[PDB]
């Protein structure tokens, strides 16, 4: 089998992509955002606190003939942003993009952190890192991907994420129409429950490749790019008037200027993020300060390869049983 997804920013900087999942039966079209940096399918429920609850579609159990309740089962996880969730279980019958998975574990939320409630364009996550991270309790469970696997042509799915346009999700297969050249494929660390490879280096600009390690995660559902201080400063030094602001919480720059380019190394592959792709806009609306897509990793304790690393290649997501990483460019 195979399944094939079109996933949409959520606004005009491309903070987030979701992506309709078929839930229950009849379907319940929810949009998720689709979270190779975590592990639970989690969603807005006919029981989220009501005042939690402010535009999202909601899922009602009830109203799926094929739900069942996961007893004594019950989810709570805690994102890297601060944000958090927490609820019970149901499975349920799950399709992306054509594909089917029954009895998948659907984590209905009790609670929502502020930053979901505000969010009304994202109904819930779909993690897709390894199931080791899932966090329901006392039995945990498989994502969605590791539950589909047996049944998919080839043991991947693939990102192919828009620059300010709407990209795709496939499940099972690699479409060789939707990148250039060829895929070059790096190893993965399963031991962090990411997506947790090393970059060979980076340029900025026309500036010369520095080889140098730079270990961290594929994670779509990161907006930015995190890495180590001293590759944001030699980044950033590239932008006259950019600045580190304590204020604002990370590098900002002069919306006036035009930003310099940023390739990262995939083994002897290069992938290059134009710089368009790392302006985020003004910090408050009317602002002339922007904020900078690329920032400093320093404190989280990992690098991430976030959204505006991703968006500018076509990644698998190989889950064979060595799992590994493939970029092209596209
Ligand atoms: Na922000």
């Given at each position: 089998?195979?399944?094939?997804?079109?996933?949409?920013?959520?606004?005009?900087?491309?903070?987030?992509?979701?992506?309709?999942?078929?839930?229950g039966?009849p379907?319940?079209?929810?949009?998720?955002?689709?979270?190779?940096?975590?592990?639970?399918?989690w969603?807005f429920?006919?029981?989220t606190?009501?005042?939690?609850?402010?535009?999202?579609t909601?899922?009602?159990?009830?109203?799926?003939?094929?739900?069942?309740?996961?007893?004594?089962?019950?989810?709570?996880?805690?994102?890297?942003?601060?944000?958090?969730?927490?609820?019970?279980?149901?499975?349920?019958?799950?399709?992306?993009?054509g594909?089917?998975?029954?009895?998948?574990?659907?984590?209905?939320?009790?609670?929502?952190?502020?930053?979901?409630?505000?969010?009304?364009?994202?109904?819930?996550?779909?993690?897709?890192?390894?199931?080791?991270?899932?966090?329901?309790?006392?039995?945990?469970?498989?994502?969605?991907?590791?539950?589909?696997?047996?049944?998919?042509?080839?043991?991947?799915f693939?990102?192919?994420?828009?620059?300010?346009?709407?990209?795709t999700?496939?499940?099972?297969?690699?479409?060789?129409?939707?990148?250039?050249?060829?895929?070059?494929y790096?190893?993965?660390?399963?031991?962090?429950?990411?997506?947790?490879?090393?970059?060979?280096?980076?340029?900025?600009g026309?500036?010369?490749?520095?080889?140098?390690?730079?270990?961290?995660?594929?994670?779509?559902?990161?907006?930015?790019?995190?890495?180590?201080?001293?590759?944001?400063?030699?980044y950033?030094?590239?932008?006259?008037?950019?600045?580190?602001?304590?204020?604002?919480?990370?590098?900002?720059?002069?919306?006036?200027?035009?930003?310099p380019?940023?390739?990262?190394?995939?083994?002897?592959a290069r992938?290059?993020?134009?710089?368009?792709?790392?302006?985020?806009?003004?910090?408050?609306?009317?602002?002339?300060?922007?904020?900078?897509?690329?920032?400093?990793?320093?404190?989280?304790?990992?690098?991430?390869?976030?959204?505006?690393?991703?968006?500018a290649?076509?990644?698998?997501?190989?889950?064979?049983?060595?799992?590994?990483?493939?970029?092209?460019?596209?």
């Open positions: 089998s195979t399944g094939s997804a079109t996933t949409t920013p959520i606004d005009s900087l491309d903070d987030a992509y979701i992506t309709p999942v078929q839930i039966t379907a319940q079209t929810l949009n998720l955002d689709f979270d190779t940096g975590s592990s639970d399918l969603v429920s006919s029981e606190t009501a005042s939690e609850v402010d535009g999202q909601i899922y009602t159990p009830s109203k799926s003939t094929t739900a069942k309740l996961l007893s004594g089962a019950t989810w709570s996880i805690s994102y890297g942003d601060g944000s958090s969730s927490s609820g019970d279980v149901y499975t349920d019958t799950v399709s992306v993009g594909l089917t998975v029954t009895g998948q574990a659907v984590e209905s939320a009790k609670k929502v952190s502020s930053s979901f409630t505000e969010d009304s364009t994202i109904d819930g996550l779909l993690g897709l890192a390894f199931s080791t991270l899932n966090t329901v309790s006392p039995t945990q469970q498989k994502t969605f991907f590791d539950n589909a696997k047996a049944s998919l042509d080839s043991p991947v693939t990102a192919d994420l828009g620059y300010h346009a709407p990209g999700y496939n499940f099972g297969f690699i479409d060789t129409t939707a990148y250039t050249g060829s895929i070059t790096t190893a993965v660390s399963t031991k962090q429950g990411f997506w947790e490879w090393t970059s060979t280096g980076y340029a900025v026309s500036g010369t490749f520095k080889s140098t390690s730079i270990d961290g995660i594929a994670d779509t559902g990161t907006t930015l790019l995190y890495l180590p201080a001293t590759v944001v400063s030699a950033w030094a590239q932008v006259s008037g950019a600045k580190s602001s304590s204020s604002v919480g990370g590098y900002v720059f002069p919306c006036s200027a035009t930003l380019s940023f390739t990262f190394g995939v083994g002897s992938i290059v993020i134009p710089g368009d792709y790392i302006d985020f806009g003004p910090i408050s609306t009317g602002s002339s300060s922007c904020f900078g897509g690329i920032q400093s990793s320093a404190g989280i304790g990992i690098n991430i390869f976030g959204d505006v690393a991703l968006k290649a076509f990644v698998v997501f190989n889950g064979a049983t060595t799992p590994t990483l493939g970029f092209a460019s596209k």
